[PDB]
């Protein structure tokens, strides 16, 4: 009866496998292709965990259903995301748009998203739905300001944070908030988990951006500087700008049609920099803000699992 995460994730994964079956064959193969090439299922994880501080002595079906919904919405995002970025590989295999075609991927994304809505109707509180829906809207308008920001060397840090909040933190925040609201937790514990999740999410994304310069063409399943090659000016790059007026002008002149060597030069400068570490540092401060609040929660196995999971999240590198 001691909650086992591994075991919990499989129950959500099996519920995802059924949910993906379709009257249309290709949509089924595409969804399964993506589902099985596999990712870390963090969102479903935070939902299960976030519900142990409520009033259910065991995880209810209602919470497994929100977990299934969250991963399906996440997936819809990934699929449409690879169509927009002309991306090549996702989770180590071909993105849908490349294994089939562009029409298919767009359709699969709609499919995945519709299923997510079907599955959220297992929640009964009409305020959660209003909460989850307005959040998805912010996510999307976020994704738009980011595409619209592409190669803008004049953007500010306070503005990069607002961008990773809508883009990534927001759905981790919903995973922890709703997960508690499903097992009837109280104002405080929920407010507590809403905040814990939001901080993990901010740290989460900051880490991705750092790992885009420090990782490997192989472990990243993509170049490196990848985000810069697409014009995304992330935390590491904003930091090196404020303290390096040469690099700042070097970034002001940067755009898609620039020669691969001006890029190489840029991504090569960020690495021997302190900025990769100042960035990592912000991730860390963010993680402590989360660990502090996790402590203020009741002792037990759940609190031990969240503490454990929140500690890998940061001490990660892939």
């Amino acid at each position: 009866a001691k909650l086992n995460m591994n075991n919990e994730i499989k129950k959500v994964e099996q519920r995802l496998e059924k949910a993906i079956k379709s009257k249309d064959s290709v949509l089924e193969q595409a969804s399964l292709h993506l589902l099985s090439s596999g990712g870390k299922r963090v969102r479903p994880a935070f939902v299960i965990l976030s519900s142990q501080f409520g009033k259910d002595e065991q995880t209810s079906e209602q919470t497994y259903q929100v977990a299934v919904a969250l991963e399906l919405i996440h997936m819809a995002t990934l699929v449409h995301d690879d169509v927009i970025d002309k991306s090549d590989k996702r989770r180590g295999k071909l993105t849908i748009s490349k294994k089939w075609d562009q029409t298919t991927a767009i359709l699969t994304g709609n499919f995945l998203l519709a299923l997510g809505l079907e599955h959220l109707m297992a929640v009964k509180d009409n305020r959660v739905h209003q909460l989850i829906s307005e959040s998805i809207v912010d996510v999307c308008r976020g994704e738009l300001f980011q595409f619209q920001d592409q190669f803008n060397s004049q953007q500010t840090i306070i503005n990069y944070l607002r961008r990773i909040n809508r883009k990534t933190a927001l759905l981790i925040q919903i995973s922890t908030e709703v997960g508690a609201i499903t097992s009837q937790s109280d104002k405080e514990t929920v407010r507590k988990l809403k905040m814990i999740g939001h901080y993990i999410g901010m740290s989460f994304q900051i880490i991705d951006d750092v790992l885009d310069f420090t990782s490997t063409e192989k472990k990243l399943g993509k170049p490196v500087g990848s985000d810069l090659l697409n014009g995304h000016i992330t935390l590491p790059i904003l930091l090196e700008m404020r303290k390096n007026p040469d690099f700042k002008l070097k970034i002001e002149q940067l755009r898609r049609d620039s020669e691969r060597k001006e890029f190489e030069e840029c991504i090569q400068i960020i690495r021997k920099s302190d900025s990769i570490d100042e960035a990592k540092a912000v991730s860390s401060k963010y993680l402590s803000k989360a660990l502090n609040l996790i402590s203020e929660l009741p002792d037990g196995h759940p609190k031990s699992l969240l503490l454990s999971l929140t500690k890998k999240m940061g001490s990660r590198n892939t």
Binding site: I158, L161, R162, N165, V282, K285, Y286, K289
Partner: peptide, 17 residues
């Protein structure tokens, strides 16, 4: 704590949209 700052500018703009 620069994060002291920021996380509340966001907070405010989430109310006074």
């Amino acid at each position: 704590k620069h994060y002291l700052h920021d996380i509340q500018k966001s907070y405010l703009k989430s109310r006074g949209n």
